[PDB]
Amino acid sequence: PKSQVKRQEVISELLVTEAAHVRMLRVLHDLFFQPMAECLFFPLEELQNIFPSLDELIEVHSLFLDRLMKRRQESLIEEIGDVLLARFDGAEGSWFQKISSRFCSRQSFALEQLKAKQRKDPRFCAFVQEAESRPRCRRLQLKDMIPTEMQRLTKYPLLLQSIGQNTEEPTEREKVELAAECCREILHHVNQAVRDMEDLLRLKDYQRRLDLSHLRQSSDPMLSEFKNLDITKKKLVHEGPLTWRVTKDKAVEVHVLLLDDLLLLLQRQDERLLLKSHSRTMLRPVLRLTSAMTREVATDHKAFYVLFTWDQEAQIYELVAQTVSERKNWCALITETAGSLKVP
């Protein structure tokens, strides 16, 4: 006691919530995933991208539950670290990371795919509503069960920390603290994979739509690299519509992508996204960020300028947002992204 009552309370909580987590994942499989496969609402390939490796996800949380239960039955309990390391360190740690990360990365894709089906297909709408009326859902909707894996990853450090900072015996406490650290690395690697997947799917759709016919037609030297442009594997820092004032007398609606080292000024033409050099030639739509600098426009608090210190011609992009905050945010983001870039 009482470091130790708290130690036992949190070890119990870990067990009891790991069980709850297993049960929901099984509900998600039995009530949604499996019957969706059988009804074939999506081709199976699509269904697997909505629930990436649900079977094996259940298994890795299951094996964790069974070890925790095995240890609880055979002990109050001293020594839990070895069990925590057995799920979160070494080859098992790696495997749990791989499987959880596959699932979590697809969360927001899954949510949208399900939501678009419900809106579009009354059959599938009635199907989800019926599954959600069932006692085994415990009042949770399909949209609440999916995020649950990512929620649980965020919980592991909280739980392992407490246990750790309430463990008296030193070698045990090191084990627990090592497992807490493993859960932090896991959460971090998953958080990074979620962003990579979110960015990847979004940029891959932008690649499909990207029209490069003008950069190919240009024999302007500065645009010869972007031939050939492939934004697919780049980091999408921020994006949004802005109005682009090529002059005081010519405004161009543009959708701009701030990647990690390029600024892309895209023209929306129906579904397509164009990179038009259009300029009074001389103002280009794809710009290297290494040299970028933003500035306020006093006559217009919604506007800003972007200039490239490397542009021997200099070469002002006057862009305007719908609110002051939003321009403020564009300037902050541009500056900070450019600020990261090393110089030769």
Side-chain angles (χ1 to χ4, degrees), residues 52-65:
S53 292
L54 188 57
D55 276 343
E56 183 67 25
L57 189 63
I58 291 161
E59 287 305 318
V60 294
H61 286 278
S62 288
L63 212 211
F64 189 37
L65 212 215

Side-chain angles (χ1 to χ4, degrees), residues 1 41 54 72 86 111 130 138 147 170 193 226 251 265 272 292 294 308 310 320 323 328 330:
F41 283 122
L54 188 57
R72 169 75 216 148
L111 290 169
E130 180 76 7
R138 19 216 306 136
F226 313 109
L265 309 165
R272 278 175 88 30
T294 64
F308 302 82
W310 277 351
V320 21
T323 72
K328 220 112 96 172
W330 269 105

Side-chain angles (χ1 to χ4, degrees), residues 103-112 146-148 150 198:
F103 187 85
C104 289
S105 291
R106 277 292 182 157
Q107 182 180 307
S108 59
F109 172 83
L111 290 169
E112 62 167 299
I146 293 155
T148 289
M150 178 72 258
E198 286 172 17

